[PDB]
From Swiss-Prot, chain A:
Belongs to the eIF4E-binding protein family. Changing K8R: Impaired ubiquitination by the BCR(KLHL25) complex. The modification Phosphothreonine is found at T1, T21, T28. The modification Phosphoserine is found at S16, S34. The modification Phosphotyrosine is found at Y5. Repressor of translation initiation that regulates EIF4E activity by preventing its assembly into the eIF4F complex: hypophosphorylated form competes with EIF4G1/EIF4G3 and strongly binds to EIF4E, leading to repress translation. In contrast, hyperphosphorylated form dissociates from EIF4E, allowing interaction between EIF4G1/EIF4G3 and EIF4E, leading to initiation of translation. Mediates the regulation of protein translation by hormones, growth factors and other stimuli that signal through the MAP kinase and mTORC1 pathways. Hypophosphorylated EIF4EBP1 competes with EIF4G1/EIF4G3 to interact with EIF4E; insulin stimulated MAP-kinase (MAPK1 and MAPK3) or mTORC1 phosphorylation of EIF4EBP1 causes dissociation of the complex allowing EIF4G1/EIF4G3 to bind and consequent initiation of translation. Interacts (via TOS motif) with RPTOR; promoting phosphorylation by mTORC1. There is a cross-link at K8 (Glycyl lysine isopeptide (Lys-Gly) (interchain with G-Cter in ubiquitin)). This is Eukaryotic translation initiation factor 4E-binding protein 1. It is found in: Cytoplasm; Nucleus. Phosphorylated on serine and threonine residues in response to insulin, EGF and PDGF. It comes from Homo sapiens (Human). The gene is EIF4EBP1. A motif (YXXXXLphi motif) lies at residues 5-11.
From Swiss-Prot, chain B:
One of its GO terms (cellular component) is eukaryotic translation initiation factor 4F complex. The modification N6-acetyllysine is found at K75. This is Eukaryotic translation initiation factor 4E type 2. Signal peptide: none annotated. GO terms for biological process: miRNA-mediated gene silencing by inhibition of translation; negative regulation of translation; negative regulation of translational initiation; negative regulation of type I interferon-mediated signaling pathway; rescue of stalled ribosome; translational initiation. Belongs to the eukaryotic initiation factor 4E family. There is a cross-link at K75, K163 (Glycyl lysine isopeptide (Lys-Gly) (interchain with G-Cter in ISG15)). It comes from Homo sapiens. The chain holds residues 52 to 224 of 245 of the full protein. Interacts with EIF4EBP1, EIF4EBP2 and EIF4EBP3. Does not interact with eIF4G (EIF4G1, EIF4G2 or EIF4G3). Component of the 4EHP-GYF2 complex, at least composed of EIF4E2, GIGYF2 and ZNF598. Interacts with GIGYF2 (via the 4EHP-binding motif); the interaction is direct. Interacts with EIF4ENIF1/4E-T (via YXXXXLphi motif); increasing affinity for the 7-methylguanosine-containing mRNA cap.
């Protein structure tokens, strides 16, 4: 019962406003974390 | 005054992004959506500078050979000409997160390393001597990655990678 996702599905999951904000915990590293 | 529902697609494991120029954690996520939040707010490895590495390992597994999960472990390695690292890294981790490798618990994580004249992408597994696992990992890499068949893939134990030419 392994959770399996094909590439196309994962790509389409990016099309959600949930993804449009950074994680609060995101460290500010110059040149790495935008 | 909205009326909303929210549910996210779980992953088989929690994963942690790491960075190195000392390896430091960027963050940990447990859902496809949370992954894109971290990924979309990181520079792509192609647009990276100097001698830096990204790591994406199962939560709890540090991206170091010393970690108990990486005892008796090894990795497949792909050396890439400049310009391929961003696309390959994306395809690799999407394949890892999507459980495309189908080797049970054997996967530890993935690395991409930008160097001077080339880039290197690798995926680590727990048991270097498990030939059935290392071959299945090999076969999945050639698929999910879009590399020519003559692209050389190297499998090395972690000890093979330490203190050697």
């Amino acid at each position: 019962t392994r959770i399996i996702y094909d590439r196309k599905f994962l790509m389409e999951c990016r099309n959600s406003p949930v993804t449009k904000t950074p994680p609060r915990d995101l460290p500010t590293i110059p040149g790495v974390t935008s | 005054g909205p009326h909303m529902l929210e549910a996210e697609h779980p992953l088989q494991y929690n994963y942690t992004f790491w960075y190195s120029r000392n390896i430091k954690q960027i963050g940990t996520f447990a859902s496809v959506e949370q992954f894109w939040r971290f990924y979309s707010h990181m520079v792509r490895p192609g647009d990276l500078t100097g001698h830096s590495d990204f790591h994406l390992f199962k939560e709890g597994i540090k991206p170091m050979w010393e970690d108990d999960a990486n005892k008796n472990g090894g990795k497949w390695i792909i050396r890439l000409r400049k310009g391929l690292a961003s696309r390959c890294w994306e395809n690799l981790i999407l394949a890892m997160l999507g459980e495309q490798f189908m080797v049970g618990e054997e996967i530890c994580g993935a690395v991409v390393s930008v160097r001077f004249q080339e880039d290197i992408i690798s995926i680590w597994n727990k048991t270097a001597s498990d030939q059935a696992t290392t071959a299945r990992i090999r076969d999945t890499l050639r698929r999910v990655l879009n590399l020519p068949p003559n692209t050389i893939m190297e499998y090395k134990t972690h000890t093979d990678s330490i203190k050697m030419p």
